Design an enzyme around this catalytic site. Structure first.
Site, short mmCIF file in Angstrom:
data_model
loop_
_atom_site.label_atom_id
_atom_site.label_comp_id
_atom_site.label_asym_id
_atom_site.label_seq_id
_atom_site.Cartn_x
_atom_site.Cartn_y
_atom_site.Cartn_z
N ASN B 93 0.80 -1.23 0.00
CA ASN B 93 0.00 0.00 0.00
C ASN B 93 0.84 1.29 0.00
OD1 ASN B 93 -1.50 -2.05 2.33
ND2 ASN B 93 -2.60 -1.57 0.42
N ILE B 101 1.26 7.02 0.94
CA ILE B 101 0.58 5.97 1.69
C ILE B 101 -0.91 6.03 1.39
CG2 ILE B 101 -0.12 5.22 4.00
CD1 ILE B 101 2.60 6.35 5.01
N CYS B 102 -1.49 4.93 0.93
CA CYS B 102 -2.95 4.86 0.70
C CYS B 102 -3.65 4.24 1.91
CB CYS B 102 -3.30 4.09 -0.57
SG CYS B 102 -5.08 4.10 -0.91
N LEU B 103 -4.09 5.11 2.81
CA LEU B 103 -4.72 4.72 4.07
C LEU B 103 -6.18 5.18 4.03
CD1 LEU B 103 -4.30 3.63 7.01
CD2 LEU B 103 -3.59 5.96 7.61
#
Lengths: 117, 166
Positions: B93, B101-103
């Site tokens: 991710n 960061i893909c949160l």
């Protein structure tokens, strides 16, 4: 000055009479395809990277797709393999995008020539 | 606004100093998780930095990571922008180069102003033990995990983190 290498460790490549202690310090990655090797890699190959604390450079892979993904993501200059240990009688078309120099050889002198510069 | 962003970040600044001072695991849930969290330049409270330590039972064990946190003027209505440093981790991710960061919790659909930095940094830490299958920023390290080749995932990250020290 030498080149960086991703070496795919089939039975035949493990057999090569290479004094691995001399190369362990270099930027080399050993991808181990356990799907086409019966046990663990030859102990003495494993031991030679440990003597220098470069044991991290050997990477075991349970599937070929995952092995090739490592090749792209690692992105080293040279990709040494031997397809003869995977066909009963393949390198994905991608790899040329990520790697600069593919040696896929049957002959011993070639394999040694590249891995020893 | 700055009237409200400043007052709220200052409240948090006191919580963070209070929280990260104690070694008591009651008043500090972040023992050996969030090692530090402070503004880069104390005069400018919009740029924070954080050191975390990778969760146990992961390839990120026994390695720290530095996380960049930008707080917008619209805080806490809008979430912060959280990112790793460039070429500092291999995570499904995480776009290793940009450090993006893909949160989920930081999307406008799911963001609640009630969440703060220590929670956000904590969520980043949580991401390392719990990768997401949904859609990776590292489709290659992503492909390894989909094909359940953990030995490959375990080694390549440990290779990356090890070769990052020499």
């Amino acid at each position: 000055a030498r080149k960086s290498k991703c070496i795919i460790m089939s039975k035949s490549i493990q057999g090569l009479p290479i004094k691995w202690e001399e190369y362990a310090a270099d930027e080399v990655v050993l991808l181990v395809p356990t799907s086409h090797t019966d046990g663990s890699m030859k102990q003495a190959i494993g031991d030679a990277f440990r003597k220098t604390k470069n044991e991290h450079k050997i990477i075991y892979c349970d599937s070929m797709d995952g092995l090739w993904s490592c090749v792209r993501r690692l992105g080293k200059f040279q990709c040494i393999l031997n397809s003869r240990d995977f066909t009963s009688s393949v390198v994905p078309e991608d790899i040329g995008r990520f790697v600069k120099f593919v040696v896929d050889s049957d002959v011993e002198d070639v394999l040694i020539d590249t891995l020893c510069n | 606004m700055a009237d409200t962003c400043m007052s709220r970040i200052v409240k948090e600044y006191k919580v963070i100093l209070k929280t990260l001072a104690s070694d008591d695991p009651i008043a500090n849930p972040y023992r050996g998780i969030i090692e530090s969290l402070n503004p880069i330049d104390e005069t400018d409270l919009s740029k924070w930095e954080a050191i975390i330590s990778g969760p146990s039972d992961t390839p990120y064990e026994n390695h720290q990571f530095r996380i960049l946190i930008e707080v917008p003027s619209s805080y806490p209505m809008n979430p912060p922008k959280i990112s790793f440093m460039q070429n500092n981790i291999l995570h499904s991710n995480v776009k290793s180069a940009t450090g993006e960061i893909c949160l989920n919790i930081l999307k406008p659909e799911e963001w609640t102003p009630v969440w703060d930095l220590l929670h956000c940094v904590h969520a980043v830490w949580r991401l390392l033990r719990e990768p997401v299958s949904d859609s990776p920023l590292d489709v290659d390290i992503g492909n390894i995990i989909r094909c359940g080749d953990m030995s490959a995932y375990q080694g390549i990250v440990k290779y990356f983190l090890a070769e990052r020290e020499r």
